[PDB]
């Protein structure tokens, strides 16, 4: 049984590294300790950051949207490496990605976060939590919930090898609305779940029930996504540019 499961873990890790330029390993090393990021903590510091790397709040949001569009393509490439995924119904592949990317983006953003701020543009920059919190409403409440989640998620001390499998688990979620053929999606998720469980037992033998703790984080994660979507609708209150986004 375990031959396939070790193959799956390694394959997903290799694909994860190929698809995502800034890994957690590289992010934690930047956030702790040889070249340091430019820190954006202030309106004046943001201004210099742009010369180095409408109004301030809007342009940060637009910056976030640009990155998110990039991440959607990274995630999609990654998904296509997950054994079985490309053999699913094409509408189902689109549905899984459509409803999965937000969950994945905030999961992976935790890798770039500590309790005080978030790495930006390939780790070249670091924007503080308090500066993001200071932005005028409704932009000030945009990132805070993601920081609160990240603190709780990061306490699990997952590495890139664990996260590669967890992200795959998220993508293969059989409860997405409008799926045509749930069976093979659940069947693949079952195999990914088995692989994640073994990976956490081998990689973190002294962390009791880490597998269970990790799956429980989906509860807060989906809640975060639902609140975020609602805030995106509130924010909706060059034509080609709006099309891209």
Ligand X SMILES: O=C1NC(=O)[C@H](Cc2ccc3cc(OCc4ccccc4F)ccc3c2)S1
Residues of the shown chain interacting with ligand X in the complex, contacts defined by CB under 6 A: 60, 63-65, 67-68, 102, 105, 109, 118, 120, 127, 132, 143, 232, 241
Instruction: Look at phi and psi of residue 179 and say left if phi exceeds 0, alpha if psi is from -120 to 50, else beta.
Output: beta
**Per rule CB under 8 A, is residue 175 in the interface with a second copy?**
yes
Q: How far apart are CA 67 and CA 213, in angstroms?
A: 29
**Per rule CB under 8 A, is residue 194 in the interface with a second copy?**
yes
Q: Which residues, other chains included, contact 60 with Cβ-Cβ below 8 Å and sequence gap of 6+?
A: 46, 127, 132, 135, 139
**Per rule CB under 8 A, is residue 152 in the interface with a second copy?**
yes
Contact yes or no for 116/129 (Cβ under 8 A): yes
Smaller CB separation from ligand X, 7 or 29: 29
Of the residues 212, 229, 234, 235, which one makes contact with a second copy according to CB under 8 A: 212
Smaller CB separation from a second copy, 121 or 207: 207
> Is the dihedral angle over the CA atoms 184, 187, 193, 195 positive or is it negative?
negative
228 is in an annotated binding site: yes
204 is in an annotated binding site: no
**Per rule CB under 8 A, is residue 141 in the interface with a second copy?**
no
For residue 56, the 8-state DSSP code is H
Of the residues 193, 198, 199, 200, which one makes contact with a second copy according to CB under 8 A: 193
**Per rule CB under 8 A, is residue 81 in the interface with a second copy?**
no
Contact partner at residue 120 from ligand X, a second copy, none, CB < 5 to 8 Å by partner kind: ligand X
Strand order in the sheet with 125-128: 38-40, 125-128, 117-120, 113-114
207 is in an annotated binding site: no
Q: Which residue has the tokens 């899984």?
A: 96
238 is in an annotated binding site: no
Report cis status (omega within 30 of 0) of the bond before 138: yes
Binding-site residue set for rosiglitazone: 65-68, 102, 228, 245
């Amino acid at each position: 049984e375990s031959a396939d499961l070790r193959a799956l873990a390694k394959h997903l890790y290799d694909s994860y590294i190929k698809s995502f330029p800034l890994t957690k390993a590289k992010a934690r090393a930047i956030l702790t300790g040889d070249k340091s990021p430019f820190v954006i903590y202030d309106m004046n510091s943001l201004m210099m950051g742009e010369d180095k790397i409408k109004e301030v709040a809007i342009r940060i949001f637009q910056g976030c949207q640009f990155r998110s569009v990039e991440a959607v393509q990274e995630i999609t490439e990654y998904a296509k490496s997950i054994p079985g995924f490309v053999n699913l119904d094409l509408n189902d592949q689109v549905t899984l990605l459509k409803y999965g990317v937000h969950e994945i983006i905030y999961t992976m953003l935790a890798s770039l976060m500590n309790k005080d701020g978030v790495l930006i543009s390939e780790g070249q920059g670091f924007m503080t939590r308090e500066f993001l919190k200071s932005l005028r409403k409704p932009f000030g409440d945009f990132m805070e919930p993601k920081f609160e989640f990240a603190v709780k998620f990061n306490a699990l001390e997952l590495d890139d090898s664990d996260l590669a499998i967890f992200i795959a688990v998220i993508i293969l979620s059989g409860d997405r609305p409008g799926l045509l053929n749930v069976k093979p999606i659940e069947d693949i998720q079952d195999n990914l779940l088995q692989a994640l469980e073994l990976q956490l037992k081998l990689n973190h033998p002294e962390s009791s029930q880490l597998f269970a703790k990790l799956l429980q984080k989906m509860t807060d994660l989906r809640q975060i996504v639902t609140e975020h979507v609602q805030l995106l609708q509130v924010i909706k209150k060059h034509p080609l540019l709006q099309e891209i986004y």
